[PDB]
């Protein structure tokens, strides 16, 4: 909708972390920059892949629970997620580009839940 940058912060507020990492961590922190920095259409397909839903609605995203899990050490693997359980499985990459490229392809390749 006509606005300056989508309010994905609410989503971040309820976003969960696994293993031994947090939001301040390079993996999550860099990850968030990529999602927020993406265009509106990119965000829409991004959310469908991870949780089977559309980009940030006029309301807050904090109403939905998001789960972040680390696949493993910095290695080249295709990112995976489940809309049914709203879980994101991404390996801990050493660079935002490294995870951005793998992540972007995974969400674009996969078909979003959509509607109707």
Curated annotation (Swiss-Prot):
Effect of residue 91 to L: In AS; uncertain significance
Compartments where found: Cytoplasm; Nucleus
Transmembrane segments: none
Effect ascribed to mutating residue 26 to I: May be associated with AS
Superkingdom of the organism of origin: Eukaryota
Misc remark: A cysteine residue is required for ubiquitin-thioester formation.
Functional note: E3 ubiquitin-protein ligase which accepts ubiquitin from an E2 ubiquitin-conjugating enzyme in the form of a thioester and transfers it to its substrates. Several substrates have been identified including the BMAL1, ARC, LAMTOR1, RAD23A and RAD23B, MCM7 (which is involved in DNA replication), annexin A1, the PML tumor suppressor, and the cell cycle regulator CDKN1B. Additionally, may function as a cellular quality control ubiquitin ligase by helping the degradation of the cytoplasmic misfolded proteins. Finally, UBE3A also promotes its own degradation in vivo.
Known disease link: Angelman syndrome: A neurodevelopmental disorder characterized by severe motor and intellectual retardation, ataxia, frequent jerky limb movements and flapping of the arms and hands, hypotonia, seizures, absence of speech, frequent smiling and episodes of paroxysmal laughter, open-mouthed expression revealing the tongue.
Protein name per the record: Ubiquitin-protein ligase E3A
Organism: Homo sapiens (Human)
Parent-protein start and end of this portion: 762 to 875 of 875
